[PDB]
Structures are given as structure tokens and as C-alpha cells.
Amino acid sequence: PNFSGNWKIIRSENFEELLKVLGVNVMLRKIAVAAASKPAVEIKQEGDTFYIKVSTTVRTTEINFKVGEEFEEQTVDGRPCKSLVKWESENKMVCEQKLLKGEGPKTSWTLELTNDGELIDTMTADDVVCTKVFVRE
């Protein structure tokens, strides 16, 4: 199995709390939760090399990485970070993030494919876990 495709969200849990624990103000949180309610997610996987584009109503990020090699991206609250993805198991990658500037709560993300073809995206900030689930278009 593999991750390539266009993915549409089917479940989202705890996203506002994730932003809240990173100090995001209520006005910005409300805007962000609504903007991300139906994101466009596109993944192109070539072996261990990934391209991932995520677009909300007001923001669009593009990341390019190979498993095991550091790359620059942003945290969920928009801070530049150096990231590193490893395979935790066959279907599941986990990313540790380190801020380029300053300090803050520990943040990470994981992406896992299930046998039924779902993509589970987990983001952690401090002690808060946000889970989103997607299916292929």
C-alpha cells in the first residue's frame, strides 16, 4: 500500500484544543478551525520520498522530504521548524519537529495508512492529541 493520491477529510477531533494549547487566540482559532474543515490534501509518494500539499481556505503548505533526512517545514501554529520523519512500522511514519527560533511546547505528527485505506493524521502539541482521518478521492 502507499500514500499517493488526493485525500478528503472524514473525521476531525481536537483540532481547536491543539491550537489553544499552543497559545493561539480565540479569534484566530475560530478562523482556523473553519478554514480547515474541508482541506485539500495531495500526497505524491515515490518510495521513501514524499511531496505533501495541504490547502485550506486561506493557507497552502507544500513539504518535500525523504524519510530519514531533515527538512524545513512549519509547526501547526506557523513556526518554522526542522523536521525528521522515520518509519515507526510498515504503514506508519512519525515526525519530530525542532523550532528554528525560540522554544515552545513539543510538537510532532504521524501519518498511518489503515488496511481499509484510510489515512490517519495525528498531531501532538504538549499533552494534546489531535486526530484527523482521510479517505482517497
Cα(106)–Cα(58) distance, integer angstroms: 25
Task: List alpha helices for the chain, DSSP H.
Answer: 15-21, 26-35
Q: Residue 97 forms beta bridges with which residues?
A: 83
Q: Residue 50 forms beta bridges with which residues?
A: 45, 65
Cβ-contact 112, 90 below 8 angstroms = no
Nearest residue to 53 (alpha-carbon basis) of 67, 70, 36, 39: 39
User: Quick one: resolution in A?
Assistant: 1.5
Experimental method: X-ray
Nearest residue to 110 (alpha-carbon basis) of 77, 135, 84, 72: 84
Cell of 63: 513539504
Cell of 55: 490547502
Query: What one-letter code names the amino acid at 130?
Result: C
- At 84 the three-state DSSP class reads strand
Cα(92)–Cα(98) distance, integer angstroms: 20
Domains of the chain: 1-137 (2.40.128.20)
Burial of 99 (0-12, 13-18, 19+ CB in 10 A): middle
